[PDB]
Amino acid sequence: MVRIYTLTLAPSLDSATITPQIYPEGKLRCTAPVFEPGGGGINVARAIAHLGGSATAIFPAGGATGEHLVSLLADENVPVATVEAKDWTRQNLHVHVEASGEQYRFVMPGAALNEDEFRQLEEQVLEIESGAILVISGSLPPGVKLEKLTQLISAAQKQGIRCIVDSSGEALSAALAIGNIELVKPNQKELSALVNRELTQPDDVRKAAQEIVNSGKAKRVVVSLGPQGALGVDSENCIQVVPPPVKSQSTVGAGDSMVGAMTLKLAENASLEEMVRFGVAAGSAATLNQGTRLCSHDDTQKIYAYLSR
Amino acid sequence: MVRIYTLTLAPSLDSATITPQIYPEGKLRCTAPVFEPGGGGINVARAIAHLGGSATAIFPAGGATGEHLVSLLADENVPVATVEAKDWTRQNLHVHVEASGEQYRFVMPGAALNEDEFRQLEEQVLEIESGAILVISGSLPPGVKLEKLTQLISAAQKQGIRCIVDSSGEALSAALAIGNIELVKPNQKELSALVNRELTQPDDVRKAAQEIVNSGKAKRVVVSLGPQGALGVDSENCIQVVPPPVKSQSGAGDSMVGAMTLKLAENASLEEMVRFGVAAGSAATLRLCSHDDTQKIYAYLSR
Amino acid sequence: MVRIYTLTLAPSLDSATITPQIYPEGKLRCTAPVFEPGGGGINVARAIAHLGGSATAIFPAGGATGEHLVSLLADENVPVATVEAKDWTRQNLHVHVEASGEQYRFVMPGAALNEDEFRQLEEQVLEIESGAILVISGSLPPGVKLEKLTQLISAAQKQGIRCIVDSSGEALSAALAIGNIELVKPNQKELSALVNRELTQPDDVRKAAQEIVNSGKAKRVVVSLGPQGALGVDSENCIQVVPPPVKSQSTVGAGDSMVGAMTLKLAENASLEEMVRFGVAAGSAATLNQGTRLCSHDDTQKIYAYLSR
Amino acid sequence: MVRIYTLTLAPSLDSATITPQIYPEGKLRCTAPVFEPGGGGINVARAIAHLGGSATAIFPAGGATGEHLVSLLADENVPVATVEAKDWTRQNLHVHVEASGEQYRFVMPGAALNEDEFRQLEEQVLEIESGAILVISGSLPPGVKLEKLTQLISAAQKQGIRCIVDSSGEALSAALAIGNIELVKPNQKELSALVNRELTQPDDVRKAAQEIVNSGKAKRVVVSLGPQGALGVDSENCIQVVPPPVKSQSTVGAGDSMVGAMTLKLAENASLEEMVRFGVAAGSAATLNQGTRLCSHDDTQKIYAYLSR
Numbered sequence A, C, D: 001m002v003r004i005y006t007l008t009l010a011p012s013l014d015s016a017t018i019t020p021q022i023y024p025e026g027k028l029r030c031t032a033p034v035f036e037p038g039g040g041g042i043n044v045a046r047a048i049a050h051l052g053g054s055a056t057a058i059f060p061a062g063g064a065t066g067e068h069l070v071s072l073l074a075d076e077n078v079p080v081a082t083v084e085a086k087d088w089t090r091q092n093l094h095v096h097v098e099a100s101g102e103q104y105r106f107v108m109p110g111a112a113l114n115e116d117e118f119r120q121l122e123e124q125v126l127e128i129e130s131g132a133i134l135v136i137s138g139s140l141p142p143g144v145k146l147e148k149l150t151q152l153i154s155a156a157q158k159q160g161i162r163c164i165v166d167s168s169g170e171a172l173s174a175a176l177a178i179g180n181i182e183l184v185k186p187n188q189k190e191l192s193a194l195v196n197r198e199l200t201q202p203d204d205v206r207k208a209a210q211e212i213v214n215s216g217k218a219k220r221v222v223v224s225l226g227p228q229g230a231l232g233v234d235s236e237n238c239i240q241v242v243p244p245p246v247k248s249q250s251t252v253g254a255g256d257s258m259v260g261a262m263t264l265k266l267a268e269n270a271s272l273e274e275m276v277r278f279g280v281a282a283g284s285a286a287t288l289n290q291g292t293r294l295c296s297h298d299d300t301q302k303i304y305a306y307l308s309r
Numbered sequence B: 001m002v003r004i005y006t007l008t009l010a011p012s013l014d015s016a017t018i019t020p021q022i023y024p025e026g027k028l029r030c031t032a033p034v035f036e037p038g039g040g041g042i043n044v045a046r047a048i049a050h051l052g053g054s055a056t057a058i059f060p061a062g063g064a065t066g067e068h069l070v071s072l073l074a075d076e077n078v079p080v081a082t083v084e085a086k087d088w089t090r091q092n093l094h095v096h097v098e099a100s101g102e103q104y105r106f107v108m109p110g111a112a113l114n115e116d117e118f119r120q121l122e123e124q125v126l127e128i129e130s131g132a133i134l135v136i137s138g139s140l141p142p143g144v145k146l147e148k149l150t151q152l153i154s155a156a157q158k159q160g161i162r163c164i165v166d167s168s169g170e171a172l173s174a175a176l177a178i179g180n181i182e183l184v185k186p187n188q189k190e191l192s193a194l195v196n197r198e199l200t201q202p203d204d205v206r207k208a209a210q211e212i213v214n215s216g217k218a219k220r221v222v223v224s225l226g227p228q229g230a231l232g233v234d235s236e237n238c239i240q241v242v243p244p245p246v247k248s249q250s251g252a253g254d255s256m257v258g259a260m261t262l263k264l265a266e267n268a269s270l271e272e273m274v275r276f277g278v279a280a281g282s283a284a285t286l287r288l289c290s291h292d293d294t295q296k297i298y299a300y301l302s303r
């Protein structure tokens, strides 16, 4: 099993709180916030840790929020490689409403990154050994041009780093344009935005995903289908996995957990079907917990054994 | 194909309207309502008609709303067998909100049914020949005790009528208690209620469905799972079918029952029944299922 | 006291129902509907009946819904003069939601009125004796042109009929252009449109209302201020009446109840301050209920006695 | 004029952001937060400064957030007396939604205080001179028992400090139990709880307020009635004041501004009539502005001049 790294250009110190209900104007009494390390690549690395693997999270940390974020990852035993940033790590607020079981996510802009700080991040990424896997996950922070991310991916691939991209539509498109992306995970809206067409016919999603693989843009495409699970295709196989009919507490950490689970299997050189089933198991497991808590090992394992019957 | 009948103890004259936004207290301006036939069994009959089958809907019709309802089904070429009732047929309101694309469904109670009207409905049911299929679908109106429905199922079964039940709560429990129900289609909550336990484990839904079948209460249980499709079980087999990842808006449940009923009338396999049911349910959510949409999805599922 | 009549070009058979909560897509279970006679002028006449007065409601009634509407007015001791109409009387749905305590009100278009049917209504109006008061209230139905409504008001005034108008902004502006309207009840938005200017300074509402009276367009203007009650002005006096500090359950019936109360007082040749106080008492009383019941005699008298201290 | 101080046991660094839409589950893209000083007593001191008076805000401040809060009050030229606290000052979130114009207010628990910090706060209070006014306003931090609040009030009163209390519920009831509170400002619901009965009749609010005054628990009770203004009573008089029909946009900041205004009037030995009018003027002026903005001098004076004609 090869080494895994993640890159989070816009980390977040997430605070999760609970409040009886949600309405305008009045003071909504919230519980003392629970702090959790956030941001795409970081969540990916935490999920992998939860699942008994290891991934090194590369990211910029700034200010006390930054230090707080780093301290939490230490507690969760997630290895990090950090770059000191001037701008403070952002704080995003997640509000779980008891009355409705709904969760609301207020996502501020990522901390700015200056050209020098980005260079250091690039430096860390290019110290990655050939054949290792790099997951680039989360939004692009203010100050970072799309071209620079594109060049970084090209440089990384040039020295054998195997790249997974889960980000904005623009970054997604740009990454596929470089081609040979190990894995991408668009949802249906994102897939439609990618190929510029409505996916209305039964076979449309598969055809769109397969087209992306066949043109060499990505080696694997796993379309996230919400409650309908996931449809994954590579050059040879195609599989749709539907999650079991279980609870439904907090829909939020499903995506990053899925990517973490799939990356873990990718690292172990597993089959497409193992990868997709493990990804759906983990994403589903995540919905059993609060948003900021990702998948747990035991739940993932149980759902995976079931999905694999 | 055996003959097919449906029974709707609580029909509805459905009205649909459109309004810009939804908020409290203010007068929400709505477009002139549009009317269509409603009620579980009636929708089942309509779905079957869209799918090229024939089903006779048996139901009480009362007052001018009932007359409206009957006339609508006339224009739709759906065969009916009505009983004249005193209490006027209910009128439910479906509101489409432009700003959000959301739909709101206000469902009044079914019109009351006295003993004499139920009697007429029951005799209409017992006119059905042995081996035919009867779909009892929709809520139970006031003035109708569970025992009356129960005794109607027993009477129907005694003379060879094959009974499908799609209702909720006590009515469904009541039906299964009599047992030998050809098919029931609970959702996960209703299933949980029927077996009196939370269904949280991956295999919990299948086990609960299987428990109902094994007890002899139903021959087939098809658990509706919303966007996840359906899981079907019988004494011998289990099948789970997920729709294709096409578009959604919702008349799925009545269409699915209609589709599965047609298939049962054609002596289909469990697999064919559930696939066609899921196809029709999905087609309806692209209004009931159309023929071409249902066939297109069914073909894909049946590849 | 002179006799009172009302004119409702768009009656409504209101059905009132209750449901535990309101959310989209799902079947919302509502209680067996309760039916009330509805529509502007009809509600005015009902309020007047509740308050111990008598007002004959003139309106088109069509179909079984129209018959039901007529039967209900009989039960409330409201004298009627009806014209048979081809199109069936509309049915509006009022839903009270238990969990929130709020109401949602789905208002369909008024039934269509034929020219021949309008002619019959106009004929009923022009049989009213000189010196009597006519309240024209509610939206205009399809098939009725604004110019027809203004011509009716002109013809009415020509034979000594004292006209009160409560309608849409456009209808309101139209009636005022005719002028000599006994009373109008615009809200602040409408009032601002009428005088074509923003009302932003403390004295602006009063000045705007006074302007309408001074032009001869209306004899009295009573500006509805929601929770702040009403500000009434005539050629000589000005008064603002605020409702008592009690809970308001709804506000739909307030408008029509207020107009009914003020009309009654006008028929009794009461003072401006009596008129406005009685109007706010009746409006306030109406807001105590969920909507379609309007002001009760006892609530109004209690509130009126309080306000008149 | 006697000197004015305020006490905020639970200050807040108020963050505010803008987002186009609000709905569950999805990532709501918010703008980089803007900040302002927060907490009951702090806002009271801020309103007082706007109104031309001077009030010193006494409060705990912890961590970088505490420093941020202090800095912002410095930027507004508001006098403060702070105690350095170990637990970081809470950060509340105000969210404005563009699609709807609505605002959402997420109010976290106040930072905890230890024995030493609370002792320092009390020492600051008991350095206030006899005859001066102290406004204790806002929620109680977890860990600070009611008995601690009431002990503080009893001590302050012992050396002639005149105490005004704006809090809710149990804290207000406890304060009233000590008695001789110069001023309290319950809303109708709070008042109903204070006297343990539903206030349904027109004169019930006045009676309930008068009961509290008559008992000697408070010298003055001003009941805030939202858009209907306020009803104030003392041992001698009663007055209800409704604001002018000005345009309201955001109710937030109305309560604190109102307290600030009435406290300033009290410091000037104002009549009950002057005090309630100025409070309503300030409350009204605050709600003229969108967001969390407090009363301005010019808006308040304009409205008060009108009310005082």
Ligand SMILES: O=P(O)(O)OC[C@H]1O[C@@](O)(CO)[C@@H](O)[C@@H]1O
Binding pocket: B027, C010, C012, C014, C037, C038, C039, C040, C043, C092, C107, C110, C137, C138, C139, C252, C253, C255, C256
């Ligand atoms: O006259 P409109 O604007 O069409 O609204 C009619 C609705 O309002 C009342 O007229 C209330 O004002 C109702 O009883 C009714 O259903």
Ligand SMILES: O=P(O)(O)OC[C@H]1O[C@@](O)(CO)[C@@H](O)[C@@H]1O
Binding pocket: A027, D010, D012, D014, D037, D038, D039, D040, D043, D092, D107, D108, D110, D137, D138, D139, D253, D255, D256
């Ligand atoms: O004192 P509470 O109830 O915790 O509320 C604090 C909130 O109210 C203000 O004190 C407004 O009253 C704010 O600035 C703030 O964030």
Ligand SMILES: O=P(O)(O)OC[C@H]1O[C@](O)(CO)[C@@H](O)[C@@H]1O
Binding pocket: A010, A012, A014, A037, A038, A039, A040, A041, A043, A092, A107, A110, A137, A138, A139, A252, A253, A255, A256, D027
């Ligand atoms: O990467 P984005 O689009 O800026 O969103 C960040 C949010 O998503 C997570 O990365 C969840 O996906 C969070 O912990 C977080 O606050």
Ligand SMILES: O=P(O)(O)OC[C@H]1O[C@](O)(CO)[C@@H](O)[C@@H]1O
Binding pocket: B010, B012, B014, B037, B038, B039, B040, B043, B092, B107, B108, B110, B137, B138, B139, B253, B254, C027
């Ligand atoms: O049988 P129920 O539960 O009273 O629901 C009736 C509603 O559902 C349909 O039966 C759709 O299922 C309608 O046409 C209708 O108005």
